[PDB]
């Protein structure tokens, strides 16, 4: 489908943003864990 081929960059970008925010959130949660240990 040409529709899916044209939207594939959009889907890849959406997944990249999703992974970026998820990794950032996990990084942040580990930082709060260290803060609580302190």
């Amino acid at each position: 489908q040409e529709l899916f081929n044209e939207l594939k960059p959009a889907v890849d970008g959406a997944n990249f943003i999703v992974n970026h925010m998820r990794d950032q959130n996990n990084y942040n949660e580990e930082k709060d864990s260290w803060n609580r240990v302190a």
Binding site: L7, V11, D12, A14, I17, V18, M21, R22
Partner: peptide, 22 residues
Amino acid sequence: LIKHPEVKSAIEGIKYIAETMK
């Protein structure tokens, strides 16, 4: 298009960003 795994992952991810920000 909805049945594709990538689209489902993207939709769940957008919902995840929304709930996390809330």
